């Protein structure tokens, strides 16, 4: 009857309310966090937490590699109305780089996500959370109806 520790596709309002319910805003950044299915890239996991320094919720994506779960390529900073041509020209190159790297990363991550449903990959997720200094005692656990229904996570308990 065990519930996975991974959330399914939850919305931004729910993510913020879960972090606030667990007092993320009165604790150090990363002291409280949740793990959910990525809503942009199937097969990836997204860690959501509160960043005290900026007073915003932040997200970091992980995907399977041959070594286990690892940090995915990060996208370049969003365009702004105020952007100068110099900003925009650099964004072009950084966006192409991000798209190329994410394409290769997803291709490998999705193949691994699909084959080892019964997974000693779980321990490698814990390792990467530790390297990123997430307080494992601060993991928010989903209720049964909110947990991921992805088969890879059935035993992520």
Author numbering: 11 to 167
Wording from the paper:
We obtained crystal structures of LeSH in complex with three different pTyr ligands, including the phosphotyrosine itself, a 13-mer peptide derived from the pTyr381 site of DnaJ-A1, and another 13-mer peptide corresponding to the pTyr387 site in IL2Rβ. Apart from the pTyr residue, which assumed the same conformation in all three complexes, we were not able to detect the electron density for residues preceding the pTyr in the DnaJ-A1 peptide or any residues flanking the pTyr in the IL2Rβ peptide despite the high resolution (1.6–1.7 Å) of the complex structures obtained. In accordance with this observation, no electron density was detected for residues flanking the pTyr in the DnaJ-A1 peptide in complex with LeSH. However, LeSH lacks a pocket for the accommodation of a C-terminal residue to the pTyr. This explains the results from the peptide array screening showing minimal sequence selectivity by LeSH. However, the R46K mutant of LeSH bound the DnaJ-A1 and IL2βR peptides that contain multiple Asp/Glu residues markedly better than to the remaining peptides that contain fewer acidic residues. This indicates that charge–charge interaction plays a pivotal role in the LeSH-peptide ligand interaction.
To understand the molecular basis underlying the superbinding characteristics of the Legionella SH2 domains, we determined the structures of L. longbeachae LeSH and the L. pneumophila RavO SH2 domain in complex with tyrosine-phosphorylated peptides by X-ray crystallography. Compared to the Src SH2 domain, LeSH is missing two β-strands (βA and βF) but contains a 45-residue insert between the strand βE and the helix αB. This extra sequence in LeSH contains a structural motif called the pancreatic polypeptide (PP)-fold, comprising an amphipathic α-helix (named herein as αEF) packed against a polyproline segment via favorable hydrophobic contacts.
